[model samples]
Target: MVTAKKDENFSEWYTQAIVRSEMIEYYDISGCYIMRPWAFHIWEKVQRFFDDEIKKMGVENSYFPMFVSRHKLEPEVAWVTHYGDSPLPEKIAIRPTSETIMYPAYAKWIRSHRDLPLKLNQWCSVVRWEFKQPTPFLRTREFLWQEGHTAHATEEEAWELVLDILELYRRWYEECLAVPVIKGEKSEGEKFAGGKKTTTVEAFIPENGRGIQAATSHLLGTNFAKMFEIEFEDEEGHKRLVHQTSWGCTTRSLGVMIMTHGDDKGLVIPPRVASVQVVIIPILFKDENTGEILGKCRELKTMLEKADIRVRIDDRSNYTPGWKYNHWEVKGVPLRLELGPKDLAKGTARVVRRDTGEAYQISWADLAPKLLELMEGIQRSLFEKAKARLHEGIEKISTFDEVMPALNRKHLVLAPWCEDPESEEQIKKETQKLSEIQAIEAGAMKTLCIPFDQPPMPEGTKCFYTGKPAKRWTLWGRSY
Candidate 1:
């Protein structure tokens, strides 16, 4: 049983939920982790959906080297000092991001307007040494992600794909992970280091009321193109830089989903991404027809698999039916089908949902359709419940003074902003100092994003921090 209560202690609860559910294990290194099969399956489900969608948008899969001679906008870089028993000529470092590694190749491959919209994506792991001890997926030195890079003929084309890619990211969080997100553009202070503009999907953990960046799509403009000399000849025979964009979705996403939906019992995995969508546990007793019940469980498993549902049957006689129920429930299989002699006599079995402990008896003939309906219902309600909580957690305020109070109540603040990077930095410093004075656990409030969906700004509204005429409404909170 999970000992940590999610509501009372979020940090400990996150650790216990991932470990007790058998998703990951501690590693010898401080920030490295070992992903178990259960956790990998979740990533695989995410990978498949993203890969298929990108392909539809004319993107092709590619591979790049993980070891870079030197590589971050600002990454906590680690260096290799020696070779096997001997010092290398010079130190080498692994890549923190693939921009340096991929751009040089882009410069090589494109020479004409025909190569204008070159799109490539690679799935891999990257390392960035960190001194801070972090919670598992959210903050790790080595993590997995998929990065997509593209080049376009004009600024218009690059900007168009940025929003298109952003839409898919929002779908991944909302539809695949069953987590709600706000679509927006990152502030100048929060934008990617070498990119022109950064668009993002921000997800919130209702448990702590903190924001987490689910994914990002950046418009790199001509900065890297100018630096790397990635220029292509136009149809008029004039050479110009190719506008570019890069976007990514990381393993940190799994952590956000768990923190959003998991309960005291264990994880509440969404049905769409669950490794084992349904688990079968056979009930055995001394005086009953044990062979018949076991045989019936096998038959049900075959039928479910034939219907394209991932299914597992735990027919071990050593463990009691009660023990197996708790086992699968804690592991978070979406639905559990319990078969016993009495149920077999009635041509039925008990189907239980992990998200909610609700159970019902359905006939063997109706098993496939009945469980499918429950599975869809579970998936939809999980998204709806989270979307509702996310909307409820946001508070709209007109001034900087109201920011802390709203954040204190754990509501993300939507407030007016001058949208200047220098003013943004100053606000961060002020908030941190204020945080110390008030002894608030929230260290400092930072801008989450300037949302694309805008609410009316009445006349004469002043900036929350700079006191200038407000430029836009920005999302602010203590983030993960």
Candidate 2:
């Protein structure tokens, strides 16, 4: 069997690791992909986690039309302008994002203060005609995601919703997936085209040293509310424009889970979001005892399911247990239990954790609690490992000498700067990947991350190119 060797080839390893491990696949379309049952199940798990999180906090979900008229697109001029020269219809454009399209509907729905905190979300796919190379789960131009838009009587309420949603997005990534993120403001050059202010939880992927923007929460301010004339009457019968915010999380999170935590063997899935928490593989030796071994496998499956665990017994007669084990491990199942004649006779089975290559032998009586405890532990361990790797990948450097080493090398470089436009532009040209540029021409900069070193500045930690008491720091890297 061809195993996924990550060190040798990062990209091909991912293809094999994902397919061998059964995560996703390339479909007929160049950029679009098919989410096999295994990958979709993991997505559903993510959906359930965030759905409960948002619903409890008073954010209700609803559906919106996919089609947007060119008329609807103009209201958010800043946003539509950003798609410059890109393929868009005269009056109708594919929903590049939902803010312009959703707010018009909000104007009709919100008439009075009672509907003040009208929070609604939609689960859908958005298309951006991406002609660039598409990475499996990371940089697909077209992908599925959830978008939440809310309206309030006051701008303060709307702004708070943006930060609150950001908090939830950060927590979901850290607590559930065990992935760590950097909380920061996107450079003016990088902020969402039409947003007043954009806050992002940037994720660092080791496979490449670039910030994968995991989620963004944007304050539409009065931009859209004013365009759509989405005004509401307060208790005093005064008409005021509604404040609005839109935030979303996409399928890219799944890519991070695989890249951050996966090892050479394949993906090391965290239990909380893994499609199959435990897979039981029955090993048969003698022909005479085939029935007995298969029977014991069925029994363990029932026991695990009764305990509310998502467990599957792979007893397919055609494939050998070794083959099945390889197949399941590649798919990144959190736990795998093996039942052979020896273990069945002793009333115990050996469980192999997919996250860690560790194996355990537990008695049938202890199966229920043991599996639960192990799964929980795996989830935490996976998250911790990913967080640690992220911490390690962040290279803190202040001088030119230190910067050159990380160039062409995968690292998140944090450098101090004076925030000069020319300096940021120079670095952008050298990186080959212009789209990956995280440049800030104007901003209070501090020491942030970059892939390359800046030339000697005028004096004191000057703008890497223009010497002036550096204003602040900025992060720069080549991203997916």
Candidate 3:
């Protein structure tokens, strides 16, 4: 049944995993893909958890129009210029990330100091028509996300919220999705071009030998407020511009989680984020006890439901127990229960774990508790396994010549680098040249981030790339 192996053909395996697992459907448009219910269900779970937390933090949800009036911008945003064969008066632009679309409204809404902390969040889709090579969730022309824009009276409050949101993103990846990430600051050239500073959660893909940016929060100073006139009158009756912050996590995170945890079988969904945490499959046979086994499956399902565990029963007579097992495993259900005449006679059910396929028999009395503990363990182990691989993949080197060899060995290198743009540019060029010589499909490596967690730097360390005094250790990799 397998046409491609993960180790031999990763690109095909990833596409097959998503397509066969019923997560994504290819669309007529090159960069647009349809999300079936399987994918949407997981997204809704993420939305529910994140939306609740943001609301508790006093963030209000609001919607803004998708079409934005033409404004001055850098380049490569989608444009709508026609009215069904007739040209429009002026072309309108689709939102790239909603900063421009939301900020003008902030200027109009904040008139006094009381309105200073205007935090509005929008759950919407944005279009960035780069029209490059596209992957389903990773690099689509349009995708769904939550954009939170806040205006504050002071810089401290704005920066405080920036870190707060970053922590929530880290939790979403680590706790909910069972993916390990490093929270760090973007390098100087890599930060948001329009913002003063940017912080991010980066996830390492061991298979790809790369680190993908899972999420980002930007600390935009008064730059946007000054342009948009988002100034508020203080209690002392003096006018002051509001400091701002914008942060977003996109559907690309789903792609990251899949890449991190999925296996050759298909997805390995974490229990906390899985729509169906446990599925009950009745082991059927031609015997008088068939009715009893089916009834036992239903009873177990009911008991799990009462305990707030998401459960599903697969009693389809057409599919054998083996087929049912493959079906749910591909769909990434965390746990599977098998009840048959033997198990019923023994007053027990056979439990199988999705992450490890380890099966054991549990008595009816201990069924619910056992399943709960296994689910929690599955979630924890997924994170532990991924974190271990990420740690192992990090190779520290002090010389520039070792970078290409480290990358070839499926490692993301940490190198002491001088904080100079020219040095960074030369590093990129040399890596590109090495990739050409080695014939690696992955392009030139770039600075992933200046990780916040720094190992002790001995005195007077020199830059591995520029041969100057080292400023910090930077992560370098080829990314998605």
**How many pairs collide in each candidate, listed in order?**
0, 16, 0
Q: How do all the candidates rank in terms of TM-score, highest first? A: 3, 1, 2
Q: Could you give candidate 3's per-residue lDDT for residues 368-447 as a string of tens digits?
A: 88889999999999999999999999999999889888888778988888879878777888898888988856468888
Model 3 global lDDT (CA atoms, 0 to 1):
0.88
Query: Tens-digit lDDT track for model 2 on 1-480?
Result: 336577667888888877776568778878788878888887888888889989997988888877677666753221233346675444356676888788877888999999889999989988877677788878776889999998888889988888888888888788777788777666656667767878878788776566788888888887877778999898899988888888989889888877777778787777777767888888867565988888887888898889888888887878888888878877778899998888987999999887667989999999989999998888888877778887787676776456545654677666666666667666665544323343332111222332222434335665544555775666666565
Residue 187 error, candidate 2, Å:
1.4
lDDT of 1 by residue, 8-85 (tens): 998888888889889989989899999999999999999999999999999999999876674322248878878889
Model 3 lDDT at residue 258: 87
Q: Between candidates 1 and 2, which one is better according to lDDT?
A: 1
Per-candidate Cα lDDT values, in order, are 0.89, 0.76, 0.88
TM-score of each: 0.97, 0.86, 0.97
Best of the candidates, TM-score: 3
Q: lDDT score, residue 123, model 2?
A: 92
> How many clashing pairs in candidate 2?
16
Off by over 4 Å in 3: 1-3, 72-74, 440-442
Residue-pair clash count for candidate 3: 0
